[PDB]
Amino acid sequence: GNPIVVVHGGGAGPISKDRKERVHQGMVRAATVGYGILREGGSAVDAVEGAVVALEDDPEFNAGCGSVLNTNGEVEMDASIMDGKDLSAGAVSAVQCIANPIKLARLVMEKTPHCFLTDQGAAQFAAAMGVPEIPGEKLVTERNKKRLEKEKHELGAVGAVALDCKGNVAYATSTGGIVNKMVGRVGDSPCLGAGGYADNDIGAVSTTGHGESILKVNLARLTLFHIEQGKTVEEAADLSLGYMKSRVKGLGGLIVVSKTGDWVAKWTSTSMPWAAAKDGKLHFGIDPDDTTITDLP
Amino acid sequence: GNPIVVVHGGGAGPISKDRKERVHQGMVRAATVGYGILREGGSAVDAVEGAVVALEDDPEFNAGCGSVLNTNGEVEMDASIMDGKDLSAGAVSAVQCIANPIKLARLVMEKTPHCFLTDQGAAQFAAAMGVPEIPGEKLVTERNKKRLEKEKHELGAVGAVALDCKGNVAYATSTGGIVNKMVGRVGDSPCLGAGGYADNDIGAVSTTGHGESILKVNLARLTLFHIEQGKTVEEAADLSLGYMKSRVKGLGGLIVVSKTGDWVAKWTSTSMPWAAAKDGKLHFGIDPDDTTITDLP
Ligand code: NA
Numbered sequence A, B: 001g002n003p004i005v006v007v008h009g010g011g012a013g014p015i016s017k018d019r020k021e022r023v024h025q026g027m028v029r030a031a032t033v034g035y036g037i038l039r040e041g042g043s044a045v046d047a048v049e050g051a052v053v054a055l056e057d058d059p060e061f062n063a064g065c066g067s068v069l070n071t072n073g074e075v076e077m078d079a080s081i082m083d084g085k086d087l088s089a090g091a092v093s094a095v096q097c098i099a100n101p102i103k104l105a106r107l108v109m110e111k112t113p114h115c116f117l118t119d120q121g122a123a124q125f126a127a128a129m130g131v132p133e134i135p136g137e138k139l140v141t142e143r144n145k146k147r148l149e150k151e152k153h154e155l156g157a158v159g160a161v162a163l164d165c166k167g168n169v170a171y172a173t174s175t176g177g178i179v180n181k182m183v184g185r186v187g188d189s190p191c192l193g194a195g196g197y198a199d200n201d202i203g204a205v206s207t208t209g210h211g212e213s214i215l216k217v218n219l220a221r222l223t224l225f226h227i228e229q230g231k232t233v234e235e236a237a238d239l240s241l242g243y244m245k246s247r248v249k250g251l252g253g254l255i256v257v258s259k260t261g262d263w264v265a266k267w268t269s270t271s272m273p274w275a276a277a278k279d280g281k282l283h284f285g286i287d288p289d290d291t292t293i294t295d296l297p
């Protein structure tokens, strides 16, 4: 089978002229890691995790380092990961002082009889697993400090989907949330069916945008229902995002990969950084009708 | 239209002959409150909340007072509530030292721009709203201390669905989780699409059983997808519960109410206490195909 990886940044407004190149490099890097894992025969779960670790470590993206700040100027993160073979999953919410929430979500999946850990319990589990505690300041960027001050005086998670050489599908979603959010606010990112969904019998979805809207419509599972009903990945993505817009006035985006290798990146927001790698080619874009295709050997 | 309320207890193993009468009285009381709200012209949301507050206050049920204990012998609770008209929702996870997590979930829905709060931030929000702090000890029961010791030395959430006189549907789900759970473990109950789902265009579902399994299959939203495809409420519940059993080896139960007034209580566990009130009649049961019908003014 031909493996595919699709990655996305936040499903938010227009991006600054010079920030677009840092964003472009970040998306290329995430898709390169994801695809590289797939091309050596790695699993879909390792591919989506690898892609999302890259975006968490990148201060340009709203996950890990570069996470938006809550009302107290702190970084509180959420993440979920799912394997489409057995529907096994791991999720974390309101996590702090760790570099990679998606790796902690992977440890919840592999090392516990549970799939979702939160706040104090997720921090205690991270310590028991030997996950290093990093100072909160190391996750905080200057651009985010300014965003918080701007907001106080008046978006979207990162993710990845993959299809591996064995026919397995997976998704990973990670976020810092929304600027100036309440303490302990949980978005759609750690919630299965909302932040993403992966099932080998259908495909895999990872979403971004206004978390409350994504939660209310169960955006990731809804997209896969349309595929089950015979719609293409493009029709499914349009129908489910269109429904979020009309029903709950929510904007956002998503990436999909079907079990047959069809993929798409769609959004109702102004932009959504995205990249896809398949058959030695890299597809990239931010704005509608700005897609670039290059060789990815 | 003719309003309906359906309530459920934990979808778990067999119940002792003497506890069966206390559970019965509890189910009757929850459905009486729910139905009483509906009969005076109250909303579906108020009805499901009223029914679940009764089960939270009842020490016989795994929600509020009577919640199972985590690995530290503490009560950590989850709850979600959803409004079918606009898909508005409120949810809380890992909440402590409050009598009624469903009322706090209602507060998240009505008083914040968010739908889900967790642990410390949920505790801080409860204090800011004037919700009284109760000694976490007032939620702990002797039977649950013994259960924890038994488990260490070696189930299921409560809920309600309703259809009101104006055609609105709602669900409420509340839990103490699973005995000896890890600190900060989040189950299906506060996760929209898993713990429940409400949509006026389809109906409302509230689930119970093994939370991790319910999360992985998105049990509540899945049930409603079968209704959308033309299945009866009975076929939808059987197909959704059957899929959870075959795909992730999970057992549990659910209650459904369609927008047209059809309702059902189904489970794959040994038992599931349930009660339904419609057209002045009360339907009650715990074991398969053993149902009592009485008049309910
Ligand atoms: Na980052």
Ligand code: NA
Pocket (backbone or CB within 6 Å): B055, B056, B057, B058, B059, B060, B061, B062, B063, B064, B065, B066, B067
């Ligand atoms: Na109770």
